Amino acid sequence: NPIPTSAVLTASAKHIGMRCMPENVAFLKCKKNDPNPEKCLDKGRDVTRCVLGLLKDLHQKCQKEMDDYVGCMYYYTNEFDLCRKEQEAFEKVCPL
Amino acid sequence: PLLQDGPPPGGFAPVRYARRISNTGPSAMAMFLAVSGAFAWGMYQVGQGNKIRRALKEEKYAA
Numbered sequence A: 001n002p003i004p005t006s007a008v009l010t011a012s013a014k015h016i017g018m019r020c021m022p023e024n025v026a027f028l029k030c031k032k033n034d035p036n037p038e039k040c041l042d043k044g045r046d047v048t049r050c051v052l053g054l055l056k057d058l059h060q061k062c063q064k065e066m067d068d069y070v071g072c073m074y075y076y077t078n079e080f081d082l083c084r085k086e087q088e089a090f091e092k093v094c095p096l
Numbered sequence B: 001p002l003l004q005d006g007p008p009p010g011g012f013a014p015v016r017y018a019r020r021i022s023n024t025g026p027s028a029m030a031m032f033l034a035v036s037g038a039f040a041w042g043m044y045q046v047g048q049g050n051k052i053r054r055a056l057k058e059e060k061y062a063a
Helices: A006-019 A021-033 A043-061 A064-075 A085-093 B030-062
Strands: none
Touching: A006 A021, A006 A043, A006 A064, A021 A043, A064 A085
């Protein structure tokens, strides 16, 4: 449901970095070999679909505790150390 | 008028004029030690804080 904006993606990067690891590694290896966007096209959809699935899962499982996290991250321009309150409120319900 | 101004019986109270010195404040190596120890402890604290800031920045970059 959420649009993959800057705030949501930065907020959920913690969960992306442990569930999207193989797809991200594959895309990075593909991009390193050749800079062609055309050649990296096919691997550029696997990561997109897996990240969107993760965002859907996080939105459904952690609904109220993620909207406030995204709102505060957008408010403070993605600075983790400032608030952090909705942060632990977020991994409290999402177990990562 | 037989009531001239003058000192009271027994004279006036003794006074001081010899430049009493208070000698206030820390003395000798007290300030030097208090500054050197503060400098060392503060440098250690600064190193610890820089380590913490480096950890924060590297986790931000890992995000």
